Design an enzyme around this catalytic site. Structure first.
Site: not given
Ligand SMILES: Nc1ncnc2c1ncn2[C@@H]1O[C@H](COP(=O)(O)O)[C@@H](O)[C@H]1O
Ligand SMILES: Nc1ncnc2c1ncn2[C@@H]1O[C@H](COP(=O)(O)O)[C@@H](O)[C@H]1O
Ligand SMILES: Nc1ncnc2c1ncn2[C@@H]1O[C@H](COP(=O)(O)O)[C@@H](O)[C@H]1O
Lengths: 300, 294, 290
Positions: A191, A193, A36, A94-95, A210
């Site tokens: 939202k 709360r 692999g 996203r990270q 998006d």
């Molecule tokens: N591949 C992924 N899929 C889903 N959630 C993620 C991923 N990578 C990071 N995140 C989460 O999304 C957060 C960032 O989202 P945002 O606040 O919209 O920029 C991070 O703090 C992570 O906990």
């Protein structure tokens, strides 16, 4: 001088790109050993060439990234003149931070550093999740917008009485920008709360735009809330169809009328069986970018 | 005190055994996945100024395990760990250490060396590195430890009659004669009838070579055939073909966890490398000689 | 055209022959010594924007020849050379490519890789590199070319009767079978003509043992071929006195006085192979096609 190679992430898309460019796809074995581990062999002379590698880092993310890493090294060691990584969907984008100083990694930065140490000289990406990711690189980054493709289709559909909806109080900035561009109304969902909607949605065909759709959890929750406030239709446009976690079937059951996406990430057999999901071709936008960058290379 | 050991999902049981010998708990961390399959990592504990070892073989699934290590290392670095040591008992991609007759391929083991250094790894510990030259792919300290004391320990324990060492290959007679000189028994590549034959490799993958040798040796009348290897890669139909083979047993270490079908195979016996790793860590921490052990 | 070639003192004669074949003059440089023995270098013509190749084996005196290459590279870089390639036919320190089991040693081949890169070298050309893994010590492109064509050229040129390829050491038994296959002849570990082929010859100790134990046991003639004639510490005497009928080598390392004197040692030109490699690289043609 211009050559284009692909990994296994998006090989059909690469064939469309080179078709438009009027060149053949560069030959390479991109595969696996029995255990692999990734097996790569560049099967033609790349000596001194201007080389583009088309590989989104979508699922399987780490495999696709290492395919990219290894292809880059083989091209470098085979003395390619210049190496460009075209990564339409950027895995790990996203990270991009450590929220509230949580002990997490800035994975988008690890990946940036990884590509740079492999010998990638510049990046092409599409609808990059956060603009600040550009500063994770010390090499040139070209971020292209698929908005023309998506707005192109939305216009063909000629929806009355079009209204742009921001799903959350994040991209209100960008949602107003889109509404101004199609000069229609804006509505915002949030939202306190998802409860509050400001702007009446009653007789409206709502549109949401998006960078990506993942589980489709937000899209589908927003769509219901709109039909609950009387909306006629709800349509979703997104560049990158990640579509994990039974998203296709969640879409199938939702109040959402249609999901329009790009072909940066090819559709599942499940997604191709879902009549609410429809793809648009990003190849022309990619070819145009490859050509602009190639023009620059021949200036000197 | 100050020492911390973390692990991803490559080899959790080995990590647990290592910390048991060290007398310390396993460092708290979530090493998981997002729904889309991207790695999810949070260090769930204070690591500021700490001497942190990450125990993760880069075994199958190779890329996922490597990236877990990458992401954990970044998480630790940003949480201000005092020092980061990657303990990678089995180093994946080690077989891609060159471009054969300069074919247009990657030197993948060098790519991985560069990746670990760029993530913030300061020191590498590894066991029976496939190629000694891989140490030169790094510009940080590399300690290559040997499973020889475990494997030879067990081989000597078995007390086999008429013991003969065999190089299955040709590109292995150097190591084989060194092993023969240490056991003082004859060497074959030679004469074989009536004798208990032992093969020692750093690695066992498909076993196709291994099992062929066992067959040939027996044909020429070998009494028994035993195989000793550090790393049980064991793909894809390896466990099955070992079962059906002239091989009497295959002894391995636990640097890679055995599969279900490998745990089913009665000919495959795995020995703990945990004591060897823990003593190594411990000696590194005090500045004692590691070489001594081998 | 934009191609320039310079030499240090390791191989001036070879660099002149390479450059004659290419149809260009050798690059003007002073490469010399100060009174205290420090390297003295000046680039005596304009190099800016040019594609500069420096031809220098790091054969003995290794550190001087290595430091010549370092200083030349630095001067060229600071004189705004468009690109620098170090063509190092024999790569000294190649035999230090790892740390053995119980040895606190340097990986010198790697220190050298690092040195070259920090000096400003952008591309490496080398010949019959001792260990392929050395390529992975560099993060710059490395082209390892083989002297097999010029060695096999000469071998076929004298139609030896009943040819047999012999592997002396247990190490290179694999590629010994690959050689035999290419000449379609047998392999050994009797009354035949034996050829041994090697990357290099240093002490000639193993060659000469091999030649003896072949002779003891039958063999007509024993011939040896090796790319790199290091030939240190009594090699020439050991060879003259040995069962070898000839040692054939290339001219990547110039023969010392003792080796010149020994009638069993014959040297072939590597200039055409180097000049073809330079042109192919320059044109963007494939090198491994050779
Ligand atoms: N591949 C992924 N899929 C889903 N959630 C993620 C991923 N990578 C990071 N995140 C989460 O999304 C957060 C960032 O989202 P945002 O606040 O919209 O920029 C991070 O703090 C992570 O906990
Ligand atoms: N993961 C792997 N599985 C099987 N073979 C590999 C792997 N990685 C590299 N190789 C190949 O195996 C050969 C190296 O084995 P060796 O000759 O024992 O050094 C090379 O030709 C490599 O291309
Ligand atoms: N310049 C040198 N001359 C002789 N032996 C060396 C040199 N450099 C390294 N060695 C040793 O030679 C061995 C490997 O060389 P080889 O026999 O050519 O494979 C290693 O044990 C090295 O320590």
């Amino acid at each position: 001088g211009l050559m284009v190679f692909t990994g296994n992430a998006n090989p059909a898309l690469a064939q469309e790109v080179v078709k438009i460019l009027g060149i053949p796809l560069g030959k390479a074995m991109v595969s696996r050993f029995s255990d692999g581990e990734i097996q790569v062999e560049i099967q033609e002379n790349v000596r001194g060439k201007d080389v583009f590698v088309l590989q989104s880092t979508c699922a399987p993310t780490n495999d696709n990234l290492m395919e990219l890493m290894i292809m880059v090294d083989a091209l470098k060691r085979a003395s390619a003149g210049r190496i460009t990584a075209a990564i339409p969907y950027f895995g790990y984008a996203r990270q991009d931070r450590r929220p509230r100083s949580a002990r997490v990694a800035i994975s988008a930065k690890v990946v940036a550093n990884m590509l740079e140490i492999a010998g990638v000289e510049r990046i092409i990406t599409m609808d990059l999740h956060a603009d600040q990711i550009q500063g994770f690189f010390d090499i040139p980054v070209d971020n292209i917008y698929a908005t023309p493709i998506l707005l192109g289709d939305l216009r063909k559909q000629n929806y009355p009485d079009l209204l742009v909806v921001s799903p959350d109080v994040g991209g209100v900035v960008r949602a107003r920008a889109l509404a101004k561009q199609l000069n229609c109304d804006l509505a915002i969902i949030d939202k306190r709360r998802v409860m509050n909607i400001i702007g009446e949605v009653e007789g409206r065909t709502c549109v949401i735009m998006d960078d990506m759709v993942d589980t489709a959890g937000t899209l589908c929750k927003a769509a219901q809330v709109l039909k609950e406030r009387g909306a006629k239709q709800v349509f979703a446009y997104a560049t990158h169809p990640v579509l994990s976690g039974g998203a296709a079937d969640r879409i199938a059951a939702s109040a959402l009328d249609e999901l329009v996406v790009t072909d940066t990430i090819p559709l599942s057999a499940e997604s191709l069986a879902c009549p609410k999901i429809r793809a648009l071709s990003s190849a022309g936008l990619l070819a145009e970018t490859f050509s602009r960058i190639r023009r620059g290379d021949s200036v000197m």
